[PDB]
Symmetry: D2
Subunit: 118 residues, 4 copies
């Protein structure tokens, strides 16, 4: 259900595998920001969700360090998978950048991403 290739509205690409385990491993590619190429991601999801039509809860993290670049920052996404004719993953995310502590008040960005199968 979750395993496969997913696209968000910014055009980043998300490529995951869900292990029978509860694990999320894959790579991420961002259309925007101080990013170039694919980054390692990792996460967890509910491998035994409710069968009432409720969504499947999950999350993952990306640190923006790869051989190409280091933005000194990390994003985590927290959301739920929703199956159907139009499967979706609706998410909210937090992007934190390393700042000195005098500038810590401005270290974190928030937003939302929606990923679809097409």
């Amino acid at each position: 259900g979750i395993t496969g290739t997913w696209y968000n509205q910014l055009g980043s690409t998300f490529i995951v595998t869900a292990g029978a385990d509860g694990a999320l491993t894959g790579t991420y590619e961002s259309a925007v920001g101080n990013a170039e190429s694919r980054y390692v991601l990792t996460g967890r999801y509910d491998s035994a969700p409710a069968t009432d039509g409720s969504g499947t809860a999950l999350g993952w993290t990306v640190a923006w360090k790869n051989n190409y670049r280091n933005a000194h920052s990390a994003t985590t996404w927290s959301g739920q998978y929703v199956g159907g004719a139009e499967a979706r993953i609706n998410t909210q995310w937090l992007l934190t950048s390393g700042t000195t502590e005098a500038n810590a008040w401005k270290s974190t960005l928030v937003g939302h991403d929606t990923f679809t199968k097409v």
Copy 2:
């Protein structure tokens, strides 16, 4: 610096190992919410941080299912590791429940946790 046992203001236990590749592995134990004993965590962090006194960006995830129970939910922490007088990890987090499409507007909580080694 990062690897070790951390406690937050809530009394939760964050047992983390920082692998040289930027991986975070370990185990989380919450003293609040619909949870008991240890849950698997995974995450990532900036393995080559900045030297200007800036802190170290990181993030991780817990999906709240183990051998004893399943809350059908997931939490992600995003924040930064700061050295100094005493070590600390400052985070903001997002916690999403699996819900129906109708209840999704109230699926996600937000907070901030401060982890220290005491």
Copy 3:
């Protein structure tokens, strides 16, 4: 043209008046949660925005108490007015409920609402 009647994706109604001194006044009606009928709102906005195509920052608050019910909660919306063809207000919101000390960790929901005039 912030002044006017808007709706979001839940079907709630946002009726506003934007002052020349930079004030926002009006009523809010929600289609979901612990609410019925109209509620007072108040906010501020940038009265002298940038003319470089940037949107106009604004924000407002609703305390969910009127003559018919009281949910012991307040929602603040923070976002911007996008002028043009399809005028929209894009927001992110924080909904805080009054809680006991026990429950403060779970006091605050985060989400996002999109308002249009259609």
Copy 4:
């Protein structure tokens, strides 16, 4: 008990009076950021909170423009007042900047402020 002068962990000064209609009005002076002097704030609070000892739900907004500068931003604070000897106002905030559509994804900062007397 919300009325008066409050300071947060950043050294900023919040001067506010709470109206009997659940109105919040006053002044904010930020110790940090693209700011100088005072700014008008306005917001709302639960004027009949739960008598179980729950905190008092509130929020306010500051747009960062005065006669000295205009930062083209607005912050909203959402939180609860908690009375008693260590009275506090515990908040989470959203700081949104005017952006072009291409940079909307990074328009909004999130933080937390604890105000104390």
